[PDB]
Design a protein around this nucleic acid. Structure first.
Ligand SMILES: [Mg+2]
Ligand SMILES: [Mg+2]
Ligand SMILES: [Mg+2]
Ligand SMILES: [Mg+2]
Ligand SMILES: [Mg+2]
Ligand SMILES: [Mg+2]
Ligand SMILES: [Mg+2]
Ligand SMILES: [Mg+2]
Ligand SMILES: [Mg+2]
Ligand SMILES: [Mg+2]
Ligand SMILES: [Mg+2]
Ligand SMILES: [Mg+2]
Ligand SMILES: [Mg+2]
Ligand SMILES: [Mg+2]
Ligand SMILES: [Mg+2]
Ligand SMILES: [Mg+2]
Ligand SMILES: [Mg+2]
Lengths: 45, 34, 86, 125, 233, 203, 154, 58
RNA sequence: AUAAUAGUAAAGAUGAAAUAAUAAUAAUAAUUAUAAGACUAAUAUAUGUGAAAAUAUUAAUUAAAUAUUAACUGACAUUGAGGGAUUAAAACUAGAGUAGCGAAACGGAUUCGAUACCCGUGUAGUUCUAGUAGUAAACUAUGAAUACAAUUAUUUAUAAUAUAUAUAUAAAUAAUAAAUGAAAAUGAAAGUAUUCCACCUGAAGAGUACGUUAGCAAUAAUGAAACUCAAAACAAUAGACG
């Protein structure tokens, strides 16, 4: 559970850090944008 | 109430108590059977 | 009930723990049995206070009433907790 | 429930003082174990003189033998043990007092705690 | 003490008098005070930085700003008790100024008690005029002391010659010691030279001390005799 | 900034302490930073502290704890005796060496213990001291016997060939009056920061 | 709420009394509106959202994670040794809440005591709630809004 | 919610661990503890017959 | 209090004296030895704890209690007419108990007198068990709750600090600022505000009478009017006085 909690957060932080990367990730998947990213991360884990 | 003012009240209370003591037999007579 | 324990213990779990300890010691009888009995006596409800028993009853009530595992504070569970104390 | 005890026993015999004490310790320990109890430690103390000439029923005492018994029991059991102590003629003063187990499980006698050793593990080591 | 209206509203009160005709002639100060107005705004102003450290006073760390697990591995999901209390008194009460150098100073004098016996003049000469390169310890206007050591340590820390603070401190201490030894040797040899070339010192330090002790002892003795006599009788 | 200047400045330089100014216990080393004035600054009562210091004080040196207290007075004591003890020690010229077989600490997280000597002596042990009369082998110093002997701002253990009765027994507990000469053998320094001198009575 | 509003008014008065510069208030909508109205009339020097500990420099979005710790910081105002915001008496108290029609408000503005309200003063500001929006009483009259006479600042 | 669940469960686990440790300590101790008669008698003999380590202060 | 031991003429009391279950039937003091009740020296500050009455020799049992964290509930709260429960001392009804103290009573003093103040016998009472009753200067003479406001010094607890330091929090206690106030003074309330309850509207007559309810009772609550005055009361000021 702890590892799961960590993974979601760390990924999110990485996404926040890199803007160009973030858009590409969103495209690959399929404030609002951040929420969508978070949802995608949750789905992954 | 100051102490001086209280003393009048105290005196009144004492008088009342005295009256009650006096009118004990009379009170008893009045109370029973009516 | 006869083999109920205080201090948030469970008799089945305790025995298993003792067995595991014994196994560990072996890796690294009558006396052992006597020690186990002594431990049980120490941790029994009937030697412990009433407070422990009450706490156990409250916990049981909570378990019964909780509308989900975490619930403490559900109006119903609060009422149930109150009842035991009452 | 861990109850400490302090009994100041009688010492009638001059040459062999501890016998009565030893008998008392045996009997009360036997009672404890018959009644779901668990005696943990039986700390002896010396043949210590009393502060004043303390007197039981139709007797007098100036010296006594002192000891602690550090046992577990029920409350009712403990109370009855106390009563039996009060009753018997071969003890001068008796005193049971609770040792609180809300925080710890292993708790040494009061004397040992005063010295330094909190748990009986420390005493063992 | 209430905020006095009447100390700062002087020109207004006089202007009224002048208007009336109570005052025929204007004061000397009147025009000057008109030109240069008083403050008259006696507020409690809040402060947002500690100047010494540079810590922020006003801000609050949020639950979202602390994502990772705490000591004892619990995730903060709620505001605590202290995060709800209105911390306005912290904005207004003046900040306790803290320096890293103070701790070093404290350490030094613990390690070197007899450095305290070296007298210190606290009466400042022009603080603006000085210009010390802490590449070395021996500055000109400044004497050799624990302060100089500490300044050297700070310089080392800044420059990152010694990344660790402790190592820099040790280095500064070692620099100091050599200098102190040199100073000690200088005085002794100067004294020796003086002795050789027929210089004459009337009162040496130890002799002076002995003399000082002697007077005190004499005072004590007479008193002590009187006390003994008193006791006897 | 101002803050930086304050941190640098001479009051910040004096390391704070709330140790007693009156300490009747055993004094093995200085407690407080001695603070001197110049004569001129003394004349207009300025010591480089928060306030003026009373005109009753005519000594140039002092010791303090608080710049200002609730009692509206700086907590000070007008005395700097510790410097004079150090200067006496220097004059005596007996170099402090660790009697235990150890390296001199001045050569080569935090340790609060005293690094070698406390800085009363940065003298090295190997030197001799010549004079017109010659090379001084034995260091001659005047001191007072108490009962131990007070020798130039330090108490020191004493030894002799024979205990002299004429000087001692004539005035049994007024031996402090008469100053005797001493030959200081060596000075060791213990962990507590006490200077353990050893002298020899000359007659 | 109206009790809250009264409490904030009292706090403002207290702060005016001792001459503090910058003062916290609870973070609600009504309270915020009130603060904004004061700012626009010219009683507050500053108005800004922030933490319980201080006013916020950057924007921080308010959520269930923050809301309990959130706060409304407000700059007070002084001139010639006299505070601008002297008073903050409210009119509609929690127990006797008063709701005037437009005519009554007009009368109040033009120096007529109504429902035991002293009619509004030269340098005064009576705030009026009308459909969960606080306004000046003059503004409300102009727009023609029958509203709750909230409070009074001078 | 997940974080809150973790917080709830972690503390409980820690408490359980502590209880187990305490139990283990008790078990280690318990050779000195007494239940039977013979053990009690042995303890008595150790205390009294040896004439050693009587708790008396001086 | 009783008894024994040895021992000798006073003892006890008071301002000074006497009366008394004091003493030449051998006391008092002393030393022992039994019994009986009732009280709890120091620590102690009622600090603290309790809703308030209250509450400090020890132990045990059962009950209730603090803070901070974690999680949960989602305004479930505040106040509270009527109502309910607890409520010092005295008092009362039973049944035990009764050392000391002690209304009353009697006696001795004191005094012009002394139904007193002092002394002596000392009954109710004080003590326990079961109740009745529901009042006190039951007082902080200050109803409860919430939000807020300027300092300092003391302790107490909490957290961090690199266990003993100087820090951040609270809590209480003591000095104050402001503010309020008739002033005395209040000081986080007697300040700024909001909410709810209780209560007051000149003094006498009166918390009286009548009535009703409750009580074994004493009584408790409820609670008028006529008649008569321009009085009546508080804070502070300066005297005089002791
Ligand atoms: Mg009144
Ligand atoms: Mg109360
Ligand atoms: Mg007491
Ligand atoms: Mg009482
Ligand atoms: Mg009674
Ligand atoms: Mg009776
Ligand atoms: Mg009498
Ligand atoms: Mg009752
Ligand atoms: Mg009454
Ligand atoms: Mg009453
Ligand atoms: Mg009372
Ligand atoms: Mg004032
Ligand atoms: Mg008012
Ligand atoms: Mg008033
Ligand atoms: Mg006061
Ligand atoms: Mg009627
Ligand atoms: Mg009545």
């Amino acid at each position: 559970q702890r590892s799961l909690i960590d993974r979601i957060q760390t990924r999110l932080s990485e996404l926040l850090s890199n803007d160009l990367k973030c858009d590409q990730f969103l495209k690959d998947h399929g404030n609002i944008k951040k929420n969508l990213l978070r949802k995608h991360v949750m789905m992954d884990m | 109430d100051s102490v001086m003012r209280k003393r009048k009240k105290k005196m009144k209370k004492h008088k009342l108590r005295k009256r009650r003591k006096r009118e004990k037999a009379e009170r008893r007579k009045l109370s029973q059977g009516r | 009930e006869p083999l109920v324990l205080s201090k948030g213990y469970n008799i089945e779990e305790v025995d298993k723990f003792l067995a595991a300890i014994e196994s560990a010691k072996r890796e690294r009888i009558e006396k052992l049995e006597d020690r186990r009995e002594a431990i049980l006596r120490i941790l029994s409800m009937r030697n412990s206070e009433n407070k422990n028993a009450i706490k156990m009853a409250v916990e049981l009530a909570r378990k019964e009433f909780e509308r989900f595992p975490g619930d403490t504070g559900s109006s119903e569970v609060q009422a149930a907790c109150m009842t035991v104390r009452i | 429930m861990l109850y400490e005890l302090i009994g100041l026993v009688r010492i009638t015999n001059s040459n062999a003082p501890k016998l009565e004490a030893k008998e008392l310790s045996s009997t009360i320990g036997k009672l404890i174990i018959q009644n779901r109890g668990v005696v943990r430690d039986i700390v002896p103390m010396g043949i210590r003189y009393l502060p004043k000439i303390m007197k039981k029923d139709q007797e007098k005492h100036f010296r006594a033998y002192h000891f602690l018994m550090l046992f577990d029991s029920s409350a009712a059991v403990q109370s009855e043990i106390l009563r039996t102590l009060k009753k018997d003629p071969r003890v001068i003063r008796s005193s049971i007092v609770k040792v609180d187990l809300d925080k710890q499980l292993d708790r040494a006698s009061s004397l040992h705690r005063s010295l330094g050793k909190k748990s009986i593990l420390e005493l063992v080591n | 003490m209430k905020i006095q209206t009447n100390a700062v509203n002087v020109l207004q009160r006089t202007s009224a008098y002048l208007k009336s005709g109570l005052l025929k002639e204007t004061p000397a100060w009147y025009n000057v005070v008109a030109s240069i107005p008083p403050s008259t705004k006696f507020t409690r102003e809040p402060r947002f930085k500690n100047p010494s450290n540079g810590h922020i006073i006003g801000k609050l760390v949020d639950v979202t700003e602390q994502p990772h697990a705490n000591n004892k591995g619990l995730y903060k999901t709620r505001p605590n008790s202290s995060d709800k209390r209105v911390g306005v008194k912290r904005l207004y009460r003046p900040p306790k100024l803290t320096y890293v150098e103070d701790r070093l100073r404290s350490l030094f004098y613990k390690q070197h008690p007899w450095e305290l016996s070296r007298p210190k003049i606290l009466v400042e000469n022009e603080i603006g005029d000085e210009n010390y390169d802490w590449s070395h310890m021996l500055q000109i206007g400044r004497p050799l002391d624990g302060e100089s050591v500490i300044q050297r340590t700070m310089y080392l820390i800044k420059t990152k010659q010694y990344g660790d603070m402790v190592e820099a401190y040790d280095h500064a201490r070692y620099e100091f010691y050599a200098l102190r030894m040199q100073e000690e040797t200088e005085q002794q040899v100067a004294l020796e030279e003086a002795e050789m070339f027929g210089s004459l010192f009337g009162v040496s330090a130890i002799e002076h001390g002995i003399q000082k002790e002697q007077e005190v002892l004499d005072v004590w003795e007479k008193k002590v005799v009187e006390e003994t006599e008193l006791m006897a009788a | 900034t101002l803050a930086e200047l304050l941190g640098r400045s001479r009051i910040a330089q004096v390391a704070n302490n709330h140790k007693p100014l009156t300490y009747t216990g055993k004094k093995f080393h200085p407690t407080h930073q001695i603070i001197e004035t110049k004569p001129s600054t003394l004349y207009r009562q300025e010591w480089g502290l928060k306030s003026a210091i009373p005109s009753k004080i005519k000594s140039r040196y002092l010791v303090y704890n608080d710049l200002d207290t609730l009692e509206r007075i700086t907590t000070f004591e007008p005395r700097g005796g510790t410097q004079w003890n150090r200067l006496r020690f220097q004059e005596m010229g007996v170099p402090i060496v660790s009697n235990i077989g150890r390296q001199n600490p001045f050569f080569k997280k935090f340790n609060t213990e005293i690094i070698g000597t406390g800085g009363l002596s940065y003298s090295l042990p190997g030197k001799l001291k010549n004079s017109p009369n010659g090379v001084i082998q034995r260091t001659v110093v005047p001191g007072r016997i108490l009962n131990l002997a007070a020798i130039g701002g330090f108490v020191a253990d004493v030894v002799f060939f024979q205990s002299p009765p004429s000087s001692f027994n004539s005035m049994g507990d007024f031996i402090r009056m008469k100053t005797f000469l001493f030959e200081i053998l060596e000075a060791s320094m213990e962990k507590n920061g006490s200077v353990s001198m050893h002298a020899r009575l000359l007659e | 709420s109206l009790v809250k509003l009264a409490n904030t008014c009292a706090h403002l008065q207290n702060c005016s009394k001792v001459r503090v510069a910058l003062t916290s208030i609870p973070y609600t909508k009504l309270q915020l509106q009130f603060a904004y109205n004061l700012y626009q009339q010219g009683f507050l020097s500053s108005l800004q959202k922030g933490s319980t500990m201080g006013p916020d420099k950057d924007f921080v979005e308010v959520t269930p994670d923050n809301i309990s710790t959130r706060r409304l910081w407000v700059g007070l105002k002084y001139r010639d040794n006299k505070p601008v915001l002297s008073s903050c008496k409210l009119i509609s108290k929690p127990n006797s809440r008063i709701h005037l029609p437009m005519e009554d408000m007009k009368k109040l503005c033009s120096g007529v005591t109504i429902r035991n309200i002293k009619p509004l003063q030269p340098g005064e500001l009576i705030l009026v709630r009308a459909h969960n929006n606080i306004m000046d009483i003059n503004e409300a009259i102009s727009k023609k809004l029958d509203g709750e006479v909230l409070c009074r600042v001078k | 919610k997940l974080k809150r669940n973790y917080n709830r469960s972690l503390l409980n686990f820690q408490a359980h661990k502590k209880k187990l440790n305490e139990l283990l300590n008790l078990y280690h101790v318990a050779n000195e503890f007494i239940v039977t008669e013979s053990q009690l008698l042995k303890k008595i003999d150790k205390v009294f017959n040896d004439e050693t380590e009587e708790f008396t202060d001086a």
